[PDB]
Design a protein around this nucleic acid. Structure first.
Ligand SMILES: [Zn+2]
Ligand SMILES: [Zn+2]
Ligand SMILES: [Zn+2]
Ligand SMILES: [Zn+2]
Lengths: 75, 84
DNA sequence: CTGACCTTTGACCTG
DNA sequence: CAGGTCAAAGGTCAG
């Protein structure tokens, strides 16, 4: 399962087993240098059914579980 | 592209594609989403078989929603609020 | 309330 | 295993 949200994985992406959503989200976040904010306590639950409720916490978990922004290639 | 893309199955207005399972316009997509999110209940002042087309789609909310469902719209395709 | 207009997601695909 | 695409989810706010 996806290390970030436990949805079905599509293989390794940026260093971890990940679903297509967390893969795409991470890529976009890095490619565009997105900066997010948490409207709650920066401790939001991130699973298959809640991952889109907080981009800040989703990204934060992407890094925590070991996604590597250095595997996002330059333009 | 062509000025013809798709057509709303509920009222006949222009459509860019499917929403909640069915070719629909911005109006009918929005009306369905709001109905589901707020669990609104409507009543028909006539015989529950009002005609739904572009010019009268707002006249009877009951019959507009019932046609959304009858043409195939899926309540469960409406998601939770995001903020993201 | 409606509906025209804007942004993000993720399934699917290639290289 | 990367990055791009685009249908269909999300969203706002004038009228
Ligand atoms: Zn995931
Ligand atoms: Zn959060
Ligand atoms: Zn319509
Ligand atoms: Zn009616």
């Amino acid at each position: 399962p996806c290390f970030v949200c436990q949805d079905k994985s599509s293989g390794y992406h940026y260093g971890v087993s990940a679903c297509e959503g967390c893969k795409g989200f991470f890529r976009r976040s890095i490619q565009k240098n997105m900066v997010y904010t948490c409207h709650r306590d920066k401790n939001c639950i991130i699973n298959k059914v809640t991952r889109n409720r907080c981009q800040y916490c989703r990204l934060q978990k992407c890094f925590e579980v070991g996604m590597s922004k250095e595997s996002v290639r330059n333009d | 592209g062509s000025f013809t893309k798709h057509i709303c199955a509920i009222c006949g207005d222009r459509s860019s594609g499917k929403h909640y399972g069915v070719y629909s316009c911005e109006g009918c997509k929005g009306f369905f989403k709001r109905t589901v999110r707020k669990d609104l209940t409507y009543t028909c002042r006539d015989n529950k078989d009002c005609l739904i087309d572009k010019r009268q789609r707002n006249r009877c909310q009951y019959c507009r929603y019932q046609k959304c469902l009858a043409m195939g719209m899926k309540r469960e395709a409406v998601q939770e609020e995001r903020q993201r």
